[PDB]
Amino acid sequence: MTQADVLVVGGVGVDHIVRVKSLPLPVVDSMMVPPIVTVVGHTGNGVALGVHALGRASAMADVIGDDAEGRLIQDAYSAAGIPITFVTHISGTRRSVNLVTEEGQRMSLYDPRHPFEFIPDPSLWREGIERSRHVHVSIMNWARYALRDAVAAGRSTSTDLHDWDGVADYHKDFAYGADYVFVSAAALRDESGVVADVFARGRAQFVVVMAGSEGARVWRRSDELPLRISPISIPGRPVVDSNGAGDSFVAAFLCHYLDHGDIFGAARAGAVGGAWACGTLGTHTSFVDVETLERLLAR
């Protein structure tokens, strides 16, 4: 209802976390695992929580289900002080089963669940856009038009492409359409070439590549080479689950860049918080606050 700093569009669901000895899975008919937790998650949700956790004002706009999980999300967001605007789809809330090893390897078994061709009433995101400084668009299929609207409304825009080929046409609208572009180095064949293209064919102001344990890479039009942002080791806090890490990174970065306009400072800030999300198990269970950030950012 009120002004928000970051509007997140889409990307809230439910995650089922199974801790396994190692990946690829053994050859068995039945294997016993430690407790399988069920948490609210998915990329958009991560960013929103992270922003809110940093004292800033976030807000959600997504398609959830008339599920039990839809309602879990609903008053989970009411538990925190986070505005959520949703429409319910018959097909139900997105959810996923994530396999995690005790050393960090992650595989995600993802259930988008919504009709690929489905578009919610644009008022879903359009009202958010009027009351928001920045818009983070998560790569739900319909969310592309939110980005379209957001840019047209002269809001700063961001997106997370996640694993993306660097080739596929699906992600492309987000890659070329958003001001600040985040993507995981995971499936990138020619990062150099992919970045260069985005700069050429899109309104990408800069491109931040997240590469797990080896940190993150920041690309600028001005620099032919990426600025390398080393991963942060937290004194007292070891890595447990790198799920929600990207979203946490993004959350910190945005919050920092919205205030300072320093791109590297924000990248450093994102490296923290990204690292903080690793000290906890379970996607989007723990986020860094302001006080904790500034202490570690002096470090």
Ligand X SMILES: Nc1ncnc2c1ncn2[C@@H]1O[C@H](COP(=O)(O)OP(=O)(O)NP(=O)(O)O)[C@@H](O)[C@H]1O
Ligand Y SMILES: C[C@H]1O[C@H](O[C@H]2[C@H](O)[C@@H](O)[C@@H](O[C@H]3[C@H](O)[C@@H](O)[C@@H](O)O[C@@H]3CO)O[C@@H]2CO)[C@H](O)[C@@H](O)[C@@H]1N[C@H]1C=C(CO)[C@@H](O)[C@H](O)[C@H]1O
The residues that touch ligand Y, with contacts defined as CB under 6 A, are: 11, 15, 30, 32, 41-43, 46, 96, 98, 108, 110, 112, 116, 139-141, 162-163, 170, 243-244, 246-247, 283
Sole binder of Mn ion in the list 50, 246, 270, 274 (CB under 5 A): 246
> How many Cα atoms within 13 Å fall on the side-chain side of residue 243?
30
Task: Quote the DSSP letter at residue 81.
Answer: T
Tell me the per-residue interface mask from 180 to 219 with Mn ion, x by CB under 5 A, - otherwise.
Answer: ----x-----------------------------------
Question: Which residue, 57 or 195, is less far from Mn ion as judged by CB?
Answer: 195
Q: Which two tokens stand for residue 187?
A: 């499936």
* Contact of residue 1 among Mn ion, a copy of itself, ligand X, none (CB under 5-8 Å per partner type): none
Q: How far is CA 285 from the centre of its chain?
A: 14
CB of 262: closest distance to a copy of itself in angstroms? 31
CA distance 162 to 185: 8
Given ligand Y, a copy of itself, Mn ion, none, residue 70, with its beta carbon under 5 to 8 Å by kind, binds: none
Q: HSE on the CB side for 55, CA within 13 Å?
A: 9
Q: How far is the CB of 194 from ligand X (least distance, A)?
A: 15
Q: Measuring CA to CA, which residue among 151, 180, 149, 154 is closest to residue 249?
A: 180
Q: Which of 32, 298 has the CB closer to a copy of itself?
A: 32
Residue 131: Cβ-neighbour burial (10 angstroms; 0-12, 13-18, 19+): middle
Considering the rule CB under 5 A, would residue 136 count as an interface residue with Mn ion? no
Q: Which residues of 30-40 are buried (b: 16+ CB within 10 A; e: fewer)?
A: eeeeeeeeebb
Radius of gyration of the chain (CA): 18
Q: How far is the CB of 138 from a copy of itself (least distance, A)?
A: 14
Q: Give me 9's structure tokens.
A: 């569009």
* Least Å from the CB of residue 285 to a copy of itself: 16
Residues that bind a copy of itself (CB under 8 A): 16, 18, 20, 23-25, 27-36, 68, 72, 91-92, 95-97, 106-113, 162-163, 184, 186-187
